[PDB]
């Protein structure tokens, strides 16, 4: 019983959250997974000064209101070569990733580790979070309050 969250630097307090190395988080399971971090899903605002401070992703994931791809370089292979806040138009599917914002983080760029997941409740589930650097905290509980999620 377990899962893998992998979390990127901080921009202005948004980051990215890649659950079990595929795209497999609903928009329920979303805002949980961001409340569990003490965060929500990030305004398009906020979205856009985060990448206005160095972020950029190529993995489709939720913010309030749409699912987009953050881009700074144009890359062929990440939405479709497109600079700024690509928002995704056309999809059969209801599963991506998702970012999280959280207020109290640094105001520009943060590429420290991520060492908690202060606000999940008491649960089964062995939750690990993983840095791009590969450094890892895990903790027992769970974060997700609808059942059709699990
Ligand atoms: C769990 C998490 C995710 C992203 C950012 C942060 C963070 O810098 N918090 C500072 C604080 O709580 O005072 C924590």
Known sequence: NQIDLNVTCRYAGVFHVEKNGRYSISRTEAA???????????????????????????????????????????????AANHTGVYILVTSNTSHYDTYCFNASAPPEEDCTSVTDLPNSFDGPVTITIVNRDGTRYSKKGEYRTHQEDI
């Not at 994931?61 to 890359?75: D, K, S, Y």
């Open 32 to 78: 949980d997974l961001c409340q569990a971090f003490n965060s929500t899903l990030p305004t398009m605002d906020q979205m856009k000064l985060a990448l206005s401070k160095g972020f950029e992703t190529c993995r489709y994931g939720f913010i309030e209101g749409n699912v987009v791809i953050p881009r700074i370089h144009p890359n062929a292979i990440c």
